[PDB]
């Protein structure tokens, strides 16, 4: 009865115009996006007209702020529903995220994942088309503490921010390793410095047999190990809104940002897999992931796709003309630097960071087809971002040529193999997931 | 010489985008509306950008507030002249109705029935087209007391609000029933509590042989009965403006909102029939009614049509994302509710309110043709609103298929039979009124 | 250890300057007020600079709006903490009450009973002095429905308004009287007009053996009677904030507005007595009442005073220069009226309303002395408002002369006798309550 198509993509880090070049492979990507009912991307940049102040985001790679005109490039490329919860949305602070919401609403762009308070950041956004409706929810597990939005109290307003998916890590250690840690705690005098916190709260906050030292949670175990788990509040709250969106839309897509690695950099964190299964358990039709700036595996769970990371769909970090003073300070310089010179010195003249490795310049655009909520097709379109090209040309997306698309499709198939996912391959380098329906 | 077509419709309770789906029956409804000279609907929702505060409208079913973008859906569907006097226009208070007027005027949408003062709410609006002009007046007989607009004094401004059609109800009781009422008044001690109101005003305000007790008017009569009558001020004032509009437009349409039932729910209140006859007596070319959220009869009076209720042309109450705190309090909940969950619990999981009954999901769009003020045709187009479909899909209008349109046309013919109205029926399920001209 | 004095007063209906005349008895009243630690009055007028729109408050006697300069007269007279919850605070709507809050905060005047949302209207205000602190809470049981403030929801803001003390009245009727009421319901056809409300909600909303007809609650009883009861929500919420204020101030005063009469006009409603006992049960040090524009009895409950009504401390209703158009319409006139002529015709040229009766022009200012929360003194100062004087001079307060103060003190003693209250009388006409401490 109802038949809807959804295009998915990863980090859209756009800082320049001319996003879609005159290359036929780039114009064919825009044609692909425009031809779908909904095209989702993750706005990994703060569009700005001047509102806000730069926050110190050194671990995030610096501030990512661009002229608000890049929003026109995003929409003209074909993207129609934006996810905004990520580790850069708060780069201009609470005033910046309020400026972003204003810019998006003035341009008529549906967005989710940020809000004036926590509920607004958690809400889904409903995009209505003549053929049906899509609900988008957006959250992130990577962000500086405090950047999460807050709901109001009877006496104070909330706080603008992002929709959080918090998680805790626990270090499993043997009983002998545990005794050495507490010995180090006592002998270094650190336990003595918690003496008054014991008197104020009534008990040692390091004694939970659990243990909290150096801002890290330790637990006695049979063998050493490492475990992660979602925050129960965030998991239940996000799941709650997913069930709400299922009643009011044909399709529910959950967009999650997560840099956190598993046992190996290409595997997702264990908490992210639990989160993705829960979202589909609550009624989501797809889970699209991003963060690590490279591709990760694709899992089919209860006949619904989980894309743990679609990498970057646009990557123009080194082309931003907005570098904060704290970011400049990370590069020792004998003279004041211009933005382009700053990034050249930051990457060691191109010998480190994202430039030398091909994984940061391959992408994937899935196009899913649903019929009455059932997944009937999941096409895979590999995207090339121009590895090895000059800094001013790399980062713009185009449909990969046959040879490169096959390499990307092989990578995705290999990353998806632990989940039992199979891929059919076309002659042009595109492919599609093998479905059970 | 002059030949004009007017499409009429009922309550437009729009809260979502994609009002006209990709269904050919829905696209053919937009084609029908766009093809007329004037398409009138009743804006039964407050479009908002944030101005105002929710009023407690529990008897009205709750607050009905939507993103102001729904105005674009109304105009793109084909509606061109809006009536705004109804029991929801004041859902965001005087500031909300001032915000609505701003939104409508910024989008170039003609409207009537609300204003900054009582005269502005009473005025007609003149919609001019190359083929002629239509004057629309809009009033409502259902609203919370005080919501009516007010005119200024020499010392104070007026009050923003709606154009009212007030009415009083009188309970006819036998003389023995009357004596019991006054006995109950005296013996319960209620008459004692009016002792000082007697001293301040000079007489008992319950002694009018009329009688006013429990905020109700009682009158001695031969047999028990029930009578209603329009407020003389509102009837003369509205009639006054109708005569004004007749001098300045080719066509004068009066739009009246009224939930009030007659002896049976499908019959209009006796005052509404007197009002409708008066409007045509003063020179109106048509009277379009709405309120009860279902269809009522059609009457031809002095060769002019009276549509006592065209039901809902759009019905998306359960899809609103704006639920006030007082509205939430009507549903006892062990945890905070989302809007969709709140409406599911309010309707008893769909077992009560408007969902179980088909009458709330059938509609009618008449298209009238006038030639020099004379009615020469009155086509009837039954509209389906999707009974039994999921909550996120029902409420959007489309031209009913042959089988359903014939059922709707039978209902209208039956509801119109007490007025002597006859209908010709086409092969597709549409029809037209039998005219005397 | 701590010793604090509190002056109390009733309705302050000020609309003109020169509140304290050059009469030594008036200057001695200001000296009395200025000499206390806290002087409480009820602001029974909307101070305005132009913000808002007049609401239709016919049952309240019309709109009561004045130049905001009257706030300077209130403070210069000696009043220092204002209560604002009453049936006139909303005379200019939600915008007017927001304008009042702005005016009060710009002048540094502590106030309670109105707010931007329901919680702000319920909160106490803390007035701090070098000798200690007083917490004031303000609520009203007389107001037009909907004027109560509202708290926000996750999706909509609250509503500015007043702190409500709602209550329900039940008419006790015999079983035979009950059967006549339902017979009148069925035979008049009124029960037939609820036919669809039965289909929508699932049951007749008039069948609760209780019964709800004509917007009135009826109950079968042994004998006819009349009972009132506080709204459980308002009683528990107000009591909740009283317990909060007790922790943060030396003294807690609850100011309640109530026109509702008991079995006789001088007795308070039964619900008001239950409310007053509860407030002191929760930790309030005094309950000051007002509304009826005349004096009522004084009760000592658990060694804490309850003043059910202190009448008017200022009464200049007929001197307002702001008469709304709806208020003008209550007087049939052959020519447009000026404010003074309008009030002369409204009172029948002075032969009715408040002018002919002395009870509306006598007042009382109690001055309470507390020592560590214990009431050690309660002086009574009768106030004269100028009965029989010209309209432009009556309504301004002054300490009553010996002869008139003794008459007022006799009235208070008589009104307080049913509660077992005794009064000592001084030679000047003032007095004090007989305390058990
Ligand atoms: Ca990131
Ligand atoms: Ca209605
Ligand atoms: Ca009053």
Residue numbers in the entry:
A (entry chain A), B (entry chain A), C (entry chain A): 1 to 208, 211 to 439
Pull verbatim passages from the article behind this deposition.
In the mutagenesis studies, all residues except for His295 were substituted with alanine, while His295 was substituted with asparagine, with the same size as histidine, because of the instability of the His295A variant during the purification and enzyme reaction. The in vitro experiment revealed that all variants lacked epimerase activity, indicating that the four residues are crucial for catalysis. In contrast, the loss of catalytic activity of the His295N and Asp11A variants could be due to a structural collapse of the metal-binding and substrate-binding sites, caused by a breakdown of the hydrogen bonding network between six-coordination motif and Asp11/His295 via the w2 water molecule and substrate. We obtained their crystal structures, MslH Asp11A:apo and MslH His295N:apo at 2.41 and 2.55 Å resolutions, respectively. The His295N substitution had no effect on the active center organization, while the Asp11A substitution led to the flexibility of His295 in the MslH Asp11A:apo crystal structure, where a 1:1 alternative state was observed for the His295 residue. Moreover, the comparison of the MslH His295N:apo structure with the MslH:MslA Trp21G complex structure showed that the distance between the Cα center of MslA Gly21 and Oδ of Asn295 atom is 4.5 Å, which is longer than that (3.4 Å) in the MslH:MslA Trp21G structure.
The lasso peptide MS-271 is a ribosomally synthesized and post-translationally modified peptide (RiPP) consisting of 21 amino acids with D-tryptophan at the C-terminus, and is derived from the precursor peptide MslA.
